[PDB]
Amino acid sequence: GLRLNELSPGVGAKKTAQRRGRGIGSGLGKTGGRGVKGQKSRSGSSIR
């Protein structure tokens, strides 16, 4: 290894995790991918 500065993970290795509800531009704002009023949009929903 050269240095603790120049260590890259090797493109494709990492990905940014998704963050719901952080504005219009991120693609996951407001509802956060959940849709509208319904059971599956709620805070403890699942598929059973």
Binding site: I24, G25, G29, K30
Partner: protein, 103 residues
């Protein structure tokens, strides 16, 4: 003492040693461009109107510089629809100095 020329999809009424900014051209700075398709030359009292081009008449311009214009903010918003987008724009221009209007 003036002419009408076509540059960048637009038309311009030009006089000598006039600084005119037009659309971006593929010419270097200080390079001299000759417009030999002028539309009209009005030299004092003589009016030469080309149909569509005044034959023989020409104007030489000098490419003073190239640059970006004023930044423009483009704002798009769809009310009640969770839609907003912004972007910036700066149009490219060239500055020409009219050198002469050949009849």
């Amino acid at each position: 003492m003036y002419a009408v020329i076509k540059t960048g999809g637009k038309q311009h009424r030009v006089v000598v040693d006039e600084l005119l900014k037009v659309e971006l051209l593929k010419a270097e700075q200080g390079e001299t461009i000759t417009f030999n398709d002028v539309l009209m030359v009005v030299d004092g009292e003589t009016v030469k109107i080309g149909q569509p081009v005044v034959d023989g008449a020409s104007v030489e311009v000098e490419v003073i510089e190239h640059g970006r214009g004023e930044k423009i903010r483009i704002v798009k918003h769809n009310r009640r629809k969770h839609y907003h987008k912004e972007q910036g724009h700066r149009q490219w221009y060239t500055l020409l100095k009219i050198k002469a209007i050949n009849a």
